[PDB]
Design a protein around this nucleic acid. Structure first.
Ligand SMILES: [Mg+2]
Ligand SMILES: [Mg+2]
Ligand SMILES: [Mg+2]
Lengths: 57, 120, 50, 241
RNA sequence: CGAGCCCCGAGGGGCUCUCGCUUCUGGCGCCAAGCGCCCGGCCGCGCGCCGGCCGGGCGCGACCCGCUCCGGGGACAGUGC
RNA sequence: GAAAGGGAGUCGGGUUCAGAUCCCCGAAUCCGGAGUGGCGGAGAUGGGCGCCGCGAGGCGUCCAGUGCGGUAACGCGACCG
């Protein structure tokens, strides 16, 4: 609809029942979930790696 | 140990502004309302079209002051004719006068209201 | 319009407040969208780094 | 022991590119109003430039202890206020109406104030002590006063704050005050003050005349110059011996 | 953390880059966690740093000091005659 | 600073000598307001344990409860911030 028509639409007509629903597409939401999880896992990996590397003087 | 500037911008500090407390009124008395109800309603229009509006649409046609809006016209008619009005339509005539079509409430009859005004 | 060089719209993080800062770099040839560009003294020699 | 296991440390590291910086003190880096910048830069200029001795002599003020004794003495000779002048005038009117008469009754010694009054007293050699504020902003009203006082032989001191002299004379500001004749019980304290003040000001007038001021660089410039000096001194130390 | 500069007793100060936390990903990131010191109220061991429960403040976290915001020129440029 | 740009929401029939998407008739719709809250609906009204009660169902206590469905795309009348 036109932007000022959205003021009189109900909430359900303007979003989708999902995180970032009505603002981001499902495919890129999945991509962002996977990206966040895997990059945090990578941070854990590099922290563990330097922790086991610093065990020697 | 607590006065800190967390922003690099100096803004003008907020100072109180007193409300005016004048020692004399600049005008001795208020100027009265020149646009009272008698001034608002000048004279009714009694042409054939106005009579047709009276007998058909339950509408009284008046010539009003050009500065009077629909609310003022409605209240003036309500006060000085003791009738309830449904709506007011307003135009400005080519000669400069303002003309108001005042449609009365359904329980008020424009014909005998015009009779008691004196414009039958 | 008016220039022959493409312009690169690059988004940075504001280091002091929660906000995204958008710049209008001049596109060095070879850079693409979705690429990370690094600006500062400790940046490495790569195309697009400042 | 009973601490909730859900509680934990959540430290944020403020390295470059990491969690955004905390709201810290930026007073050194504030865009100041033009009047604040102007007064601060004037203060800096008075240390950059070579201040001639006639203006620089006012930086030498009395120490806090000596100023405290001087003001404590001068508090006994403050000029009479408007209300107590009214009281004294009414008392004189009553007394003259009934029945004593004129009765001058020994108009008491009082601290004379004002640069013109003090200058006339010094030129007439009537003042026993001259006190000059150090911060007269149009600094021409009192630049001649140290030299004039020294030539006429009256002891003079420079004190911090024209506001204090103003508070002495029930006003906002006073450039100078003058001690003329004093009460017998305060003669000894005035003598000690005069001795110390003459030791500090009138006796070393000859090098007060020559002590230029200012001509000091900024801390950054001083640090840079000293860094260069040390950079060559560290190798000259190995060169020697 | 560091190469360990150099003393080395293997301690360690004078002595250098570091007086740093971010580079494989088209994520996220603010409005402090934690600690310490206090100030109230509640019921209440009813001996006080003393039982616990609802609130509020400060400090460290986030080093100290300082005289130009930071940098580039500069007695030239420039301006007036 | 636009009666041609952006800009919510009015249509059908009748009517005059000359007016109508403006009057009349009939169907709607937008924006704003409601402090004393206009009515409904949603939130939201379930499980556990002891009892009473032939069963169903009632009593007391304790614990939940800022909605729900579809593998998904997404859907349902609301759906704290
Ligand atoms: Mg109109
Ligand atoms: Mg338009
Ligand atoms: Mg027509």
């Amino acid at each position: 609809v036109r932007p000022k028509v959205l003021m009189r639409l109900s909430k359900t007509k303007k979003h989708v029942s999902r995180a970032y629903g009505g603002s981001m597409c499902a495919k890129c939401v999945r991509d962002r979930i996977k990206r966040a999880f895997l990059i945090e896992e990578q941070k854990i990996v590099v922290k563990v790696l330097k922790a086991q590397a610093q065990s020697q003087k | 140990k607590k006065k800190i500037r967390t922003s690099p911008t100096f803004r003008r500090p907020k100072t109180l502004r007193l409300r005016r407390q004048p020692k004399y009124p600049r005008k001795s008395a208020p100027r009265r309302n020149k646009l009272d109800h008698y001034a608002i309603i000048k004279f009714p229009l009694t042409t054939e079209s106005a009579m047709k509006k009276i007998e058909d649409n339950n509408t009284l046609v008046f010539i009003v002051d050009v500065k009077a809006n629909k609310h003022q016209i409605k209240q003036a008619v309500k006060k000085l004719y003791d009738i309830d009005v449904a709506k007011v339509n307003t135009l400005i005539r080519p000669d400069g006068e303002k003309k108001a079509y005042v449609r009365l409430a359904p329980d008020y009859d424009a014909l005998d209201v015009a009779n008691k005004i004196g414009i039958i | 319009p008016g220039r022959g060089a493409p312009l690169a719209k690059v988004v940075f993080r504001d280091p002091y407040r929660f906000k995204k800062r958008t710049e209008l770099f001049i596109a060095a040839e070879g850079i693409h969208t979705g690429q990370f560009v690094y600006c500062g003294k400790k940046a490495q020699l790569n195309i697009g780094n400042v | 022991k009973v601490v909730n296991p859900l509680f934990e440390k959540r430290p944020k590291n403020f390295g470059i590119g990491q969690d955004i910086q905390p709201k810290r003190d930026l007073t050194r880096f504030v865009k100041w109003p033009r009047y604040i910048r102007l007064q601060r830069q004037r203060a800096i200029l008075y240390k950059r430039l070579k201040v001639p001795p006639a203006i620089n002599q006012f930086t030498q003020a009395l120490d806090r202890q000596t100023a405290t004794q001087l003001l404590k003495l001068a508090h006994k000779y403050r000029p009479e206020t408007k209300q107590e002048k009214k009281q004294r005038l009414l008392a004189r009117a009553e007394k003259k109406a009934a029945g004593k008469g004129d009765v001058p009754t020994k108009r008491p010694p009082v601290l004379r104030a004002g640069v013109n009054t003090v200058t006339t007293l010094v030129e007439n050699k009537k003042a026993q002590l001259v006190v000059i504020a150090h911060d007269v902003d149009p600094i021409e009203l009192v630049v001649f006063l140290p030299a004039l006082c020294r030539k006429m032989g009256v002891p003079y001191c420079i004190i911090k704050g024209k506001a204090r002299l103003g508070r002495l004379v029930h006003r906002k500001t006073c450039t100078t005050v003058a001690f003329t004749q004093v009460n017998s019980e305060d003669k000894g304290a005035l003598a000690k003050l005069v001795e110390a003040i003459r030791t500090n000001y009138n006796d070393r007038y000859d090098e007060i005349r020559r002590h230029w001021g200012g001509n000091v660089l900024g801390p950054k410039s001083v640090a840079r110059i000293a860094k260069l000096e040390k950079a060559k001194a560290k190798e000259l130390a190995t060169k020697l011996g």
